[PDB]
Design a protein around this ligand. Structure first.
Ligand SMILES: CN[C@@H]1[C@@H](O)[C@@H](O[C@@H]2[C@@H](O)[C@H](O[C@H]3O[C@H](CO)[C@@H](O)[C@H](O)[C@H]3N)[C@@H](N)C[C@H]2N)OC[C@]1(C)O
Ligand SMILES: CN[C@@H]1[C@@H](O)[C@@H](O[C@@H]2[C@@H](O)[C@H](O[C@H]3O[C@H](CO)[C@@H](O)[C@H](O)[C@H]3N)[C@@H](N)C[C@H]2N)OC[C@]1(C)O
Ligand SMILES: Cc1ncc(COP(=O)(O)O)c(CN)c1O
Ligand SMILES: Cc1ncc(COP(=O)(O)O)c(CN)c1O
Ligand SMILES: [Cl-]
Lengths: 414, 414
């Protein structure tokens, strides 16, 4: 009502008809005491699980100490060392409170160093007007051009503007395109001498202990993190070469160095390593996705599974998704719509079996409630729409599509 | 070392030679167990005192519930009602995590509604490049003009640009200028139809239970808050008329609605009201400042007290400040340099007497260590420098100064 910015783009929208009051591990609990397996995890900000006991103990002890902001420089420096040590090369780290602040800061540093203004972008980099999507070839109000993960559109912007780009910022994604496809986007920009920013806000510390692009054989001038590093506490950063981080020396807020979020983040990174989280998720998520695909097949429902491990998606028509999501919720399974799912470290062992049993029940009630969906086919356009929702770009030019058709498609999505 | 943005602009710089490990009430404690009266309070973000028991209980219970982000819409809405109810008129509220994010968001909303780009500004609005100060008449890289709180420079920008300004953003201040002076800055802009943003990040909920400008008989289109509302937890907001808050509907981050900061803020506003904090600070701060002025006088030291209540300043030459601050620290009194002090709700009763006894001892050792300062005069330029540091602008045109001299002075400060 009176909150202006509580519309969409908030997690748990599927549950807006129920009341969530508690979270613990892989589960959240509604007002009636029912437990729901959570595959939203605050849009992937909770990588360890709700109320992780080590993170919580670290936060509680920091709160009880009352230590004020910007006094625990030892802890702050230790966290910067943790982050920099997981990236190849020599990095400095500048801390922020949201992913949007980190990506705008990285863009601002590129502008300061290069003396140029134009930025090219693939993917979603946050809510700031500078990241507002406009059609290909049309700079937005803050002089950002959007290329929708297509190498042909990157090539077009580089052909016309390589000499005047401050930077290219790319949010990687690997559900609908390969690591090699993503690496190719970075390398096109590197070959013409343009600064690169790997926006790892979503995938940093989710797919491996560090930046996802590192395993794609990419190195970038600057990296931005947020969701993976702090288990739901507001902390983000830009990590990158000294030349780009020096312009961020005065990019400080009163509470940049409030202590509880630093305690949470340092504990989170340690716990991710101790519990082998990303490698175990690769195993447990792959089991979930494989078994989910089998259950879908035996029921002839029009859903395809895409991705694996820590990042997978139920690919289907919007009409089908609008049935799957409530049926899953009725069986105690929270899914995010129009996006990947975001399992946490607690999505292991018996929890995966529990989630599959709930999905099994949901697919059965869905087939019985909506028998007209049984036998429906998943179309190319279904898959493209699902990819565009998840990665905010096209998964390469779809088969049989001209580049002009790609441009008209993305224009129609805005 | 490896943290890029831990240079200046962090609080507690006077204490960088000592190690602070605990905070409670009006005091912080170093590693050797010594208690120091804290007049920084994380640059004024702690308005209740460190480890306020009601705020801490609220935060601890929220952390222990594990409730994930954007599920406690009842608490989020309640906080928005609290904030909107303290402003005259009908406001909506958009939440952010830092004061910089709130002021950039307010500026962005003005740009969206008006379709104009240029912004005029008085004061410091955060670290973003859009708030980087440039000399009068020179737009910065994000099309912001700076007017340094001078009505003549506001008039110049309005004369040249009133028709194309998206908004004027003014950070009020009342130590070196009157409420009537500040009101005059807003009214010049209102008279020519330009959108006004009152940047209350520093003074909101500090000087009264709401926006400081309200008591100056000012109403603004949008208000920004941060330091006063959350006792050191990262939460800020834009509050304003529906027409300006509708463009901020999608200005959301993953953790915009993380629950612990909302629990802290709602508890903070309630505690400020229950403990009559701002009115009691007006009384206790006035006693401190009056008695400090008397102690300074009897020792003939070159310091003047400016302001009163919740916002006062030790006005002196930089050479003198560099002696006062360490001598105060040696007696267990933490002061911020080149700025106002920021007493909290715990700066009452016996704590004020304790602070005066410590200041008394510091003034004595300072006179004995540096007898050459005794009898030195405070100059007009000392006062102007102290004002420029504190309010990031000129306190009206100083006596005997031409406008050209004012412009050259501020240019030399950048
Ligand atoms: C229709 N136009 C839209 C525009 O609304 C806006 O879409 C965002 C969308 O990107 C956001 O998802 C993205 O970020 C999430 C947050 O962490 C990740 O979790 C998702 O993986 C990722 N896809 C969504 N949460 C909220 C939408 N508002 O940008 C794209 C556009 C094509 O221009
Ligand atoms: C020399 N040029 C400078 C420039 O550095 C930069 O100064 C800021 C200064 O405004 C910051 O104080 C301001 O905000 C604080 C934070 O809450 C309030 O507490 C202070 O009341 C308020 N005065 C200071 N904390 C850190 C400095 N870096 O903007 C102005 C300039 C003239 O352009
Ligand atoms: C890839 C990516 N980049 C940047 C952002 C912006 O981060 P935030 O929502 O914390 O402001 C997001 C949203 N989490 C994102 O998905
Ligand atoms: C008046 C005012 N406006 C805006 C800001 C920016 O707020 P933050 O440091 O939280 O980003 C500040 C700094 N606290 C400020 O003093
Ligand atoms: Cl922020």
């Amino acid at each position: 009502m009176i909150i202006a910015n509580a519309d969409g783009c908030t997690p748990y929208e599927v549950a807006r008809g129920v009341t969530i009051v508690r979270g613990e591990g892989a589960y959240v609990y509604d007002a009636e005491g029912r437990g729901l397996i959570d595959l939203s995890n605050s849009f992937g900000s909770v990588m360890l699980g709700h109320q992780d006991p080590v993170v919580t103990e670290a936060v509680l002890k920091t709160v009880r100490s009352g230590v004020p902001a910007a006094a625990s420089l030892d802890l702050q420096n230790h966290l910067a060392e943790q982050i920099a040590g997981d990236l190849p090369g020599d990095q400095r780290v500048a801390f922020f409170k949201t992913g949007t602040a980190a990506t705008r800061a990285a863009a601002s540093a590129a502008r300061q160093v290069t003396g140029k203004r134009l930025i090219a972008s693939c993917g979603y980099h946050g809510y700031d007007l500078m990241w507002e999507f406009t059609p290909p070839g049309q700079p937005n109000s803050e002089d950002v051009l959007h290329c929708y993960h297509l190498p042909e559109l990157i090539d077009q912007v580089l052909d016309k503007h390589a000499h005047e780009l401050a930077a290219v910022i790319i949010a990687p994604d690997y559900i609908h395109v390969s690591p090699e496809y993503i690496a190719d986007l970075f390398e096109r920009c590197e070959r013409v001498g343009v600064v690169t920013i790997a926006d790892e806000v979503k995938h940093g510390y989710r797919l491996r202990q560090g930046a996802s692009v590192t395993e794609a054989s990419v190195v970038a001038d600057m990296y931005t993190y947020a969701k993976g590093i702090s288990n739901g506490w507001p902390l983000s950063c830009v990590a990158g070469d000294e030349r780009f981080l020096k312009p961020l020396a005065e990019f400080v807020s009163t509470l940049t160095f409030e202590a509880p979020s630093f305690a949470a983040a340092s504990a989170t990174l340690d716990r991710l390593a101790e519990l082998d989280v990303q490698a175990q998720l690769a195993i447990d998520g792959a089991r979930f996705v494989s078994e989910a695909a089998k259950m879908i097949s035996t029921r002839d429902l029009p859903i395809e599974m895409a991705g694996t491990g820590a990042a997978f998606q139920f690919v289907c028509a919007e009409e089908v998704e609008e049935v799957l999501l409530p049926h899953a919720l009725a069986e105690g399974l929270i899914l995010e719509p129009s996006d990947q799912q975001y399992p946490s470290a607690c999505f292991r062992g018996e929890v995966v079996d529990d989630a599959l049993e709930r999905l099994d029940r949901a697919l059965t009630t869905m087939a019985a409630a909506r028998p007209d969906l049984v036998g429906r086919e998943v179309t190319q356009l279904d898959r493209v729409n699902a990819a565009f929702c998840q990665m905010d770009g096209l998964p390469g030019r779809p088969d049989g599509w001209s580049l002009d058709q790609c441009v008209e498609y993305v224009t129609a999505q805005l």
